[PDB]
């Protein structure tokens, strides 16, 4: 796809990566409730990233 | 609230902000299906930010 489409796809990938950074940080804090929501948030970011990749890849 | 707590809260805030930015890019692209998943992702990141906020302060 177009450069704008590629920038969007890159941003979806960066967000998916950042959820794992935050997951590890919440694990270090032993913040279990929040780590759980962040695990699901990584799954949701992956859903977006895959949808973007299928369309803009 | 400790440095690590503050790093985690700010990271949750950043992820919420980046998903808002990505949703606007996806809207500019008129990529409907992707914008819809991103809207749901943005709300999920808000939940994480608010969950961190209610726990950590």
Curated annotation (Swiss-Prot), chains A, B:
Keywords carried by this UniProt record: Plasmid, Transcription, Transcription regulation
A single Gene Ontology molecular function, please? identical protein binding
Q: Which InterPro entries match?
A: Regulatory_Rop, Rop-like_sf
Keyword Lipid biosynthesis annotated: no
On subunit structure and binding partners, the annotation says: Antiparallel homodimer.
Please explain the role this protein plays, according to its UniProt record. Regulates plasmid DNA replication by modulating the initiation of transcription of the primer RNA precursor. Processing of the precursor of the primer, RNAII, is inhibited by hydrogen bonding of RNAII to its complementary sequence in RNAI. ROP increases the affinity of RNAI for RNAII and thus decreases the rate of replication initiation events.
Under which name does UniProt file this protein? Answer: Regulatory protein rop
Q: What is the lineage of its organism?
A: Bacteria, Pseudomonadati, Pseudomonadota, Gammaproteobacteria, Enterobacterales
């Amino acid at each position: 796809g177009t450069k704008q489409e590629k920038t969007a796809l890159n941003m979806a990938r960066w967000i998916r990566s950042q959820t794992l950074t935050l997951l590890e940080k919440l694990n270090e804090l032993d913040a279990d409730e929040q780590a759980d929501i962040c695990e699901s948030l990584h799954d949701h970011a992956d859903e977006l990233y895959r949808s973007c990749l299928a369309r803009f890849g």
